[PDB]
Amino acid sequence: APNVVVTRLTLVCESAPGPITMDLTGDLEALKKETIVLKEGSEYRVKIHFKVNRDIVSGLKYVQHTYRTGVKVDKATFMVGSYGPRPEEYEFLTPVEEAPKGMLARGTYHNKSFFTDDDKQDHLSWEWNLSIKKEWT
């Protein structure tokens, strides 16, 4: 078992009718078929769940690349920092942001996320799809 294990991604959104989350311990190829849905203009935070099993780590970073077909990538990096080993998973949350809005904001976006560090370790790399819709349903 590696020292850092990424376990889950959650979109924290007070107005969502239900939990928006994905298990990151499973088959990564199957995560693409699981699309998660955000109402346009919704306020959200990205929450990354992870475990540190053996040794203090430093310089943890969450990197999130968002692709719409035919458009330059929308890139964001977030410093996560230093964490020591413990049985319970940790939770890191990005600052609050707003999903885009308007009919032209709707559609599917293809994300690729990286949980890494200062030593450029590939703790996890994974793809997931986001659908922006006019309504939650």
Number of DSSP helices (H) and strands (E) in the chain, helices first:
0, 10
Q: Using the rule CB under 6 A, is 31 a contact of ligand A1EY6?
A: no
Q: Spell out the residues 6+ positions from residue 128 whose beta carbon is closer than 8 angstroms to its own.
A: 9, 22, 31, 32, 34, 35, 36, 111, 113
Q: Using the rule CB under 6 A, is 130 a contact of ligand A1EY6?
A: yes
Q: Using the rule CB under 6 A, is 94 a contact of ligand A1EY6?
A: no
The interface mask with ligand A1EY6, positions 37-76, x = CB under 6 A, is -x-----x---------------------x-x--x--x--
Applying CB under 6 A, the residues found at the interface with ligand A1EY6 are 38, 44, 66, 68, 71, 74, 98-100, 109, 111, 130
